[PDB]
Design an enzyme around this catalytic site. Structure first.
Site, PDB file in Angstrom:
ATOM      1  N   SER A 162      23.080 -11.585 -49.950  1.00  0.00           N
ATOM      2  CA  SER A 162      24.278 -12.066 -50.578  1.00  0.00           C
ATOM      3  C   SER A 162      25.189 -10.857 -50.652  1.00  0.00           C
ATOM      4  O   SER A 162      24.874  -9.833 -51.275  1.00  0.00           O
ATOM      5  CB  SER A 162      23.967 -12.575 -51.997  1.00  0.00           C
ATOM      6  N   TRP A 219      26.724 -19.464 -47.538  1.00  0.00           N
ATOM      7  CA  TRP A 219      27.160 -18.226 -46.948  1.00  0.00           C
ATOM      8  C   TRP A 219      26.077 -17.184 -47.050  1.00  0.00           C
ATOM      9  O   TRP A 219      25.908 -16.471 -46.071  1.00  0.00           O
ATOM     10  CB  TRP A 219      28.395 -17.683 -47.660  1.00  0.00           C
TER      11      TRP A 219
HETATM   12  C1  LIG Z   1      18.817 -22.925 -40.840  1.00  0.00           C
HETATM   13  C2  LIG Z   1      18.827 -21.824 -41.912  1.00  0.00           C
HETATM   14  C3  LIG Z   1      19.882 -22.079 -42.976  1.00  0.00           C
HETATM   15  C4  LIG Z   1      19.645 -21.147 -44.163  1.00  0.00           C
HETATM   16  C5  LIG Z   1      20.876 -21.188 -45.044  1.00  0.00           C
HETATM   17  C6  LIG Z   1      20.737 -20.204 -46.178  1.00  0.00           C
HETATM   18  C7  LIG Z   1      21.795 -19.123 -46.130  1.00  0.00           C
HETATM   19  C8  LIG Z   1      22.003 -18.841 -47.597  1.00  0.00           C
HETATM   20  C9  LIG Z   1      22.292 -17.401 -47.922  1.00  0.00           C
HETATM   21  C10 LIG Z   1      21.070 -16.532 -47.765  1.00  0.00           C
HETATM   22  O1  LIG Z   1      20.292 -16.392 -48.724  1.00  0.00           O
HETATM   23  O2  LIG Z   1      20.898 -16.007 -46.662  1.00  0.00           O
END
Ligand SMILES: CCCCCCCCCC(=O)O
Ligand SMILES: *[C@@H]1O[C@H](CO)[C@@H](O[C@@H]2O[C@H](CO)[C@@H](O)[C@H](O)[C@H]2NC(C)=O)[C@H](O[C@H]2O[C@@H](C)[C@@H](O)[C@@H](O)[C@@H]2O)[C@H]1NC(C)=O
Ligand SMILES: *[C@@H]1O[C@H](CO)[C@@H](O[C@@H]2O[C@H](CO)[C@@H](O)[C@H](O)[C@H]2NC(C)=O)[C@H](O[C@H]2O[C@@H](C)[C@@H](O)[C@@H](O)[C@@H]2O)[C@H]1NC(C)=O
Ligand SMILES: *[C@@H]1O[C@H](CO)[C@@H](O)[C@H](O)[C@H]1NC(C)=O
Ligand SMILES: *[C@@H]1O[C@H](CO)[C@@H](O)[C@H](O)[C@H]1NC(C)=O
Ligand SMILES: CCCCCCCCCC(=O)O
EC number: 4.1.2.11
Lengths: 267, 158, 158, 267
Positions: D155, D267
Site C-alpha cells: 500500500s 489499488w
Molecule cells: C488477481 C489479484 C487481485 C488482487 C487485488 C489486491 C490488490 C490490493 C492491494 C494489495 O494489497 O496489493
C-alpha cells in the site's frame, strides 16, 4: 529442370508426411556464377492446386529463411535435441498454403557466388536479385504461373521493397499474380523507430532516465546500419544497462551454451 | 509441439551440416561452398552498403494500388518494439476503419490473443506474450493470423 | 511450491470459513461477526473518505530521520506500473549513488532477476516477470530482496 | 496475555512445523467496541531471538493481510486446491524474521466494530488506529520490546503513513525500535502516477492513441478515490480497450470461475 529437384525423403523424417517437397539451386547470374538455394513445402490440403503460393523470407540482413523460417518457426518440421531427427509441426503454415523458402542474398546458408565481390550488397541489389530468382523459379515450375501469390516474412526492408519491384513489373512478368504482403517485426522509418526504442525500453524498466534523455537528444535521424559515433556511445550504454536478457524475448530464459551463433544485433 | 527451448538454434546447425541431409536436400553439390552452414552471415551483415531510411513512400504506393497490406509485432520483443511500429504506421495518417480492440481465438473465447487497429488500406496486429520470432512463442495464434490474412478478414472480436 | 493457479483465492476463502479453523485461530469468537470471511471488503472501499494526493513530503521526512527506505515493483503489473512509481520517485530529486543496473541472484549467476537504482537515502528495485503480487509470481527473487533489505545491502551486481 | 492466544495446531497442517504461532483480537476502542485480528508467525531459524520483527500489511484500501499476505504470498503456508489442507512454503519470509499479519481497518476480514459508523474510514484515522493496535500488541508481547522493527507491505499510503506516526511518537513509545520500511506496488503522487499509467498502457499495446491523448489531457490531477465524471469517461474506454486480461499480471492466464471475489479495482 523441376523433376530433378524432387526431395524423396529427409534423414530422421517422421512417419506420416504426405505433402510434396522440392529443393535445389536457381542461377541468377550466369557470368559471375551466383545462385540461390530454395526449399519448397507444398500444401497439406485436399487439393494443393487450389491453395495459394507464399514466399517466406527472413531478414537480418544475413539470416537464413530455412534455418529460421522453416526449421524453427513455421515450416512442416522441427528438429529434435539430438540434432539428427525431425518431428511434425501441427501449426505448420503449409496446412493452409504452398510455402516457398529462399535463402537470400548469396553468402547466406547454402546460397553462394563464384565472384567474391558479390557479397557486398545493398537494398536495391537485394530486391533485384530476389525478383530475378522469382522469374526463373516460375519457369522451372510453370504450373504455379498465375497462382494467387503473396510475399511474407521478417524484414521491414526486404518485404516492401521486393513487393514494389514485383508490382512495377506486372506487365513484364504477369504470371506472378501478386495479391499482397505480410510484414513481421520490421524496421520502417529510422526517425520514428528510434524514438520508439528509447521510450519503450524506459517504460519496460530496461534503461535509466539519463540514457533515455541522451538517446532522444542524439540518435533520432541516425541510421541503424551506419550510426554516428555520438549515437553509438549512448547506444552502447543502453545495451549495457539491459544486462544479460535475450533482447528478442525479454521475459524468457537465456541459453546456457554461450558460444552463441548470433554475433551481430540482427534487425 | 515441445515446449520452448532457448538453445534450439544448435539442433539446426548440426542437422543441416550432416552430409546425408545435404545430399537429400540437393544442397552444396560436390562441396562447392567452402564454409559450413550457419544461420546468419557476419560477412553479409558487415559488408552491407546502401540501406534506406524511410519505407513509408513504398507503403503509400502499395496501398494506392489496392494490394492487401498487413503488419504484425510480438509484444515482448525489445529489438523492434510495438512502440516503434505504432509510431511509424501512424505517420501514414490513414483514416481508421475499426478502432484499437482486443482479439480472441474465437468470439466465444476467453483469453486475449493480442490487439489490432484497421486503417483504410492497412491492418496492424500485436500477438500477446510473443517475442520477435512470433511462431516460436505463440504458434497457434500465428497460424490463425496467417489464415485471416489470406481471407482478408479481421481478427475475431468478442 | 505448486505451479501458478489464477483461481487460488477460492482455496483460502473455503479454508478460512471452516468452523474448526476459526476456533483454532481464535477468530470470530462465538459468531460475533455476522457476515462471512472474505478477502477484500467493498464497503470499506466505497466508504473511504480522506485519501492523500501526494506522499512525497512523508518520504522526505522519513529519509531526513535516517530510516532505511526501499520501494519495489513487479514489471508485468498495469494497475500501479513501473512508469508511475519511477516518475513519482524521480520527483524527490535525490542524488544518485548507484546508477540503474541489472541485478542477479548471485554475482556469478546469469539470469537477470530485475533492475535497481540507489539514490542517497532510498533504494528502488524492479522484479522481472512479476505482477502486482510479486511473491506469487517470483517467490525466490522476493525472498532474496527481503534478505538484502534487512541487511541494508544492494541487490547483487555481476 | 499471549498464552491464551497460542495456536497449538491448525486443521490440515502438514507434519513438520517447528516455529510458534499466535492469533487473537486486540481492542483498540472500548467505547465503540472496535477490535483488530492478528496472526503471528515466529522465525523458523535456530535462534528466533536473534531475528528482527516485521509487520506486514496489504492495502486496497479494504483487503486482508491474512488472505493475501499470509495465505497467498509470503506466509509459511499455502492452501491446497482441496480448500482443506495446508502445505509449507519454502520461500516463506519467516525463514529470515518474526512476521506479524494484522487485518486493518476494522470491517476487513475478521476485524470488526460494534459501532457501524466506524466503517467509514480515511488515511489519518487508519494510521492512528493501527499505531494503537501496535502499542497494545507490544504490551501483550513484552519480549519483543526494543527488538529491531520494520514495517512492510503492499500500500503506497498505509506503510509511509504508519511509519510517520510511529516515528513522531518515538518518545511516547521508546520500546518500538523502528529501523525502516519496505513499500511494494504503491500509489505515491496522483498527478505523476496518472501520467505514467496512460503512458505505460500505450507502450505495452493495451490502449489506442486517442484514449492515451484524452486521458493525458483530462485525467492528471484527478483523485483515484474521488474521480471526476470527465476523466471516468476516458478511464472507462481505456479499460474496455484492454479486454479480458488480468490487470495485475498481464501475460498470465485468467481464472474461469465467474463470480469473482474482487469486485472493485483495489489499488
Ligand atoms: C488477481 C489479484 C487481485 C488482487 C487485488 C489486491 C490488490 C490490493 C492491494 C494489495 O494489497 O496489493
Ligand atoms: C561455380 O564454379 C563451380 C566450379 O567451376 C561450378 O561447378 C562446376 O562446374 C563445372 C562446369 O559446369 C563442372 O564441370 C563441375 O563438375 C562443377 N562442380 C565442381 C565441383 O567443379 C559452378 O557451377 C556449376 O555447378 C555444378 C554443380 C552444376 O550445377 C553446373 O550446372 C553449374 O554450372 C559455379 N557456380 C555457378 C552458379 O555457376
Ligand atoms: C461487541 O459486542 C459484543 C456483543 O455485546 C461483545 O461480546 C459480548 O460481550 C459480552 C460482555 O463482555 C459477553 O458477555 C458476551 O459473551 C460477548 N459475546 C457475545 C456473543 O455476546 C464484544 O466484546 C466482548 O467479546 C467477547 C467475546 C469477549 O472477548 C469480551 O471480553 C469482549 O468485551 C464487543 N466487542 C468489543 C471490541 O467490545
Ligand atoms: C559443403 O561441403 C563441404 C565438403 O563436404 C563442407 O566442408 C562445407 O562446410 C559445406 N558447406 C556448406 C555451406 O554446407
Ligand atoms: C462468524 O461465525 C458465523 C457462524 O458462527 C458465520 O456465519 C460468520 O460468517 C462468521 N464470520 C466470519 C467473518 O467468518
Ligand atoms: C534468440 C533469437 C535471435 C534471432 C536473431 C535473428 C533475428 C534476425 C531477423 C529475423 O527475424 O529474420
Amino acid at each position: 529442370q523441376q523433376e530433378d529437384d524432387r526431395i524423396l525423403g529427409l534423414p530422421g523424417q517422421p512417419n506420416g508426411v504426405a505433402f510434396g517437397m522440392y529443393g535445389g539451386y536457381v542461377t541468377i547470374d550466369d557470368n559471375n556464377g551466383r545462385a540461390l538455394y530454395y526449399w519448397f513445402q507444398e500444401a497439406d490440403t485436399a487439393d494443393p492446386a487450389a491453395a495459394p503460393l507464399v514466399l517466406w523470407l527472413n531478414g537480418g540482413p544475413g539470416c537464413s529463411s530455412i534455418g529460421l523460417g522453416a526449421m524453427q518457426e513455421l515450416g512442416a518440421f522441427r528438429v529434435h535435441t539430438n540434432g539428427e531427427s525431425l518431428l511434425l509441426n501441427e501449426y505448420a503454415w503449409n496446412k493452409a498454403a504452398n510455402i516457398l523458402f529462399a535463402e537470400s542474398p548469396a553468402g547466406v546458408g547454402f546460397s553462394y557466388s563464384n565472384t567474391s565481390s558479390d557479397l557486398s550488397m545493398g537494398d536495391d541489389k537485394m530486391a533485384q536479385d530476389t525478383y530475378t530468382f522469382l522469374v526463373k523459379w516460375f519457369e522451372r515450375f510453370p504450373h504455379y504461373n498465375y497462382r494467387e501469390f503473396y510475399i511474407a516474412g521478417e524484414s521491414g526492408h526486404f518485404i516492401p521493397q521486393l513487393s514494389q519491384v514485383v508490382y512495377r513489373n506486372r506487365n513484364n512478368s504477369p504470371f506472378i499474380n501478386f495479391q499482397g504482403l505480410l510484414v513481421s517485426s520490421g524496421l520502417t522509418n529510422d526517425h520514428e523507430d528510434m524514438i520508439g526504442m528509447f521510450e519503450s525500453w524506459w517504460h519496460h524498466g530496461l534503461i535509466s532516465d539519463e540514457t533515455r534523455d541522451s538517446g532522444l537528444k542524439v540518435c533520432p535521424g541516425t541510421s541503424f546500419m551506419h550510426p554516428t559515433p555520438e549515437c553509438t556511445e549512448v547506444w552502447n550504454k543502453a545495451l549495457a544497462e539491459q544486462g544479460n536478457i535475450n533482447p528478442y524475448t525479454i521475459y524468457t530464459p537465456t541459453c546456457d551454451r554461450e558460444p552463441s551463433p548470433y554475433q551481430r544485433r540482427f534487425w | 509441439l515441445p515446449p520452448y527451448d532457448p538453445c534450439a538454434v544448435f539442433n539446426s546447425i548440426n542437422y543441416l551440416n550432416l552430409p546425408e541431409v545435404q545430399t537429400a536436400l540437393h544442397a552444396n553439390v560436390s562441396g562447392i561452398v567452402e564454409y559450413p552452414w550457419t544461420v546468419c552471415s557476419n560477412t553479409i551483415f558487415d559488408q552491407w552498403g546502401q540501406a534506406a531510411d524511410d519505407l513509408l513512400p513504398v507503403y503509400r504506393e502499395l496501398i494506392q494500388a489496392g494490394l492487401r497490406v498487413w503488419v504484425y509485432s510480438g509484444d515482448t520483443d525489445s529489438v523492434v518494439p510495438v512502440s516503434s511500429t505504432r509510431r511509424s504506421l501512424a505517420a501514414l495518417e490513414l483514416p481508421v476503419k475499426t478502432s484499437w480492440y482486443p482479439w480472441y481465438m474465437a468470439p466465444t473465447e476467453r483469453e486475449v490473443g493480442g490487439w489490432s487497429v484497421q486503417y483504410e488500406g492497412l491492418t496492424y496486429v500485436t500477438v500477446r506474450g510473443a517475442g520477435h520470432l512470433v511462431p516460436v512463442h505463440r504458434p497457434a495464434q500465428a497460424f490463425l493470423l496467417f489464415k485471416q490474412f489470406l481471407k482478408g478478414e479481421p481478427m475475431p472480436a468478442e
